[model samples]
Target: GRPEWIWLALGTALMGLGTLYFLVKGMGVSDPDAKKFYAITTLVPAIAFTMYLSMLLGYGLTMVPFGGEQNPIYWARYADWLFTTPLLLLDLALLVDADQGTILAAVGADGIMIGTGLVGALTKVYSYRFVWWAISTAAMLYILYVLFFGFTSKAESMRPEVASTFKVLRNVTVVLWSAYPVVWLIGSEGAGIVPLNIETLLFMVLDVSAKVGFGLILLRSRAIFG
Candidate 1:
């Protein structure tokens, strides 16, 4: 069996389990608003499951020559990020009842970030790759600003307990989200400092935690349920 298959299978299984968990939990939520979280969370993993399956089947991969070797690049991963990252941001935005402007700005910037990151990964020219990476990183910084400043202030004006809960969710988001760029830098996509197998494993862990674990924590909060 191929080494990549192992990581891909793990991702698929974890995402499938996450989808089932969210779906079952969602069905039990009495509140319409709370149900939204369950539905979105379920969709996140369900989409991820499909993408991982696609990668496992070798449908969404391309090879690019780097360091005199052909490296496999999974475009499907970016597609997954494109759809799911916005949804993750939406989860946070909805939790704090963030303003429409902030939500739009954040989501828009997220699109730019992911798109540029994809371009960076696919670019064959070594130096130009970092140029795209820089653009993507800038967009990511903007998103962090929105979450930390715009959303945080809004949450603070709400009930104190709600504000505290928002802090936890936002902090988790910040910490995990920040790791992505670093991983991209070290993984097959950027510097090629990490082996493909290890890179895939790291991303799988991050994705499951960010989407599934984050969802679990958000749904359990009194702010959402109450």
Candidate 2:
């Protein structure tokens, strides 16, 4: 059996379990706002589970030339990010009750980042890939701005316990979200420092942490349950 397939299968299982957990947990909450929180959080892993299943079935991968090697690029992964990252941002935006403009700006930038990244990853020319990467990076910076400056003040104004939860979630988002570019830089997409299997594993861990772990933290917070 293929090593990458094993990793993909494991990712599928984890995400599936995460979806079920969120579904059951969300059902227990009665408040409408809290219900929406669970509903959105539930969709993050639920969407991820479907994408992982797609990858496991070997549907979304394409072999792209990078650094003179034909590297397997999982387009499905970017597809997953395009949808799930915005939902993740929406969760944070709703937590602090951010304005519609801020939410739209952050989500819009996130889509651009992921979209450009996919095009970059699919690019045949090695040197030109960075052009797309640079574009994606710029979009990411705007998203970070929204998270740090645009939302921070609003989050701080919430109840003390809610503020603390938001801070932790926001910091976690910053750290994990930032790690993605580094992974891209070293993995098959850029320098080819890591092999495809390791790259797949790295993404799996990061995805689970950002999606499932983040959802768990947000839903279990006193802001929602209390």
Candidate 3:
């Protein structure tokens, strides 16, 4: 009977629903491309958070086998990332005028990061999981490089005057994405630096910020709209 879990699940569900209204607003935009981008920005979170809420309700995975503890597996989250993270990067890509090749590479790196992260999460071997952690971290580093250096360079080449807005979004994403590996290292079940309660809370905060907060920023950007 963990109240924290209930609260987080309910909050996430409500947040996901709230994004739908934004999605409709996105659909109403006159520019087809802008409407597409806006709708997707909200849509990704809607689906991701819906999955999150479902996972919280104890579906979509097996049990965690670490030390024989009967904890519910959260492996479904990686599936959420598979869909959501790339959309996030794509939204940023559109803002920054990133080329197709660069965006593809960025998305590919994200896949590796999430795939390795899921593998790490499911692994029962404590030390071996860290090995996967390192791999995941490396992938995340590449994502950051692509977004900050590759995407930024491309944006500067085309829309240098408006690149600052894109840069700011990228900067925020870098910071938030950077925290995931840290959270994995310190807060995940086997890693054990933080208690389960704190870990869940931290994760909820990050999820809301990364998805909900990210969506809000994009929705409010008149520059993007124009």
Give each model's whole-structure lDDT.
0.88, 0.89, 0.77
Query: Residue-wise lDDT of candidate 1 within 103-157, one digit each (tens)?
Result: 8999999999999999999888888888998999999999998899999988978
lDDT, residue 201, model 1: 93
How many steric overlaps are in each model, in order? 0, 0, 0
RMSD of 1: 1.3
lDDT of 2 at 115: 93
Among these predictions, the greatest lDDT belongs to 2
Residue 35, candidate 2: C-alpha displacement in angstroms: 0.5
Q: Ten residues in a row with the worst lDDT in model 2?
A: 217-226
Stretches > 4 Å off in candidate 1: none
lDDT of 2 by residue, 20-81 (tens): 99999899889888998899999999999999999899788899986777888889999889
Q: State the lDDT of candidate 3 residue by residue for 1-226, as single tens digits.
A: 5544764586567567658867777867897666867877887778777776776776665766675566544676688888889999998888877888988888998999999898888888777778888998999999998888888887786545457767777878998989888887886545677766676677777777788878777776664755
Ranking by lDDT: 2, 1, 3
Give candidate 3 regions above 4 Å deviation: 67-72
Worst 10 residues of 3 by lDDT: 2-11
lDDT for 133 (candidate 3): 88
TM-score of each: 0.96, 0.96, 0.90
By TM-score, who's the top model here? 2
lDDT of 1 at 28: 88
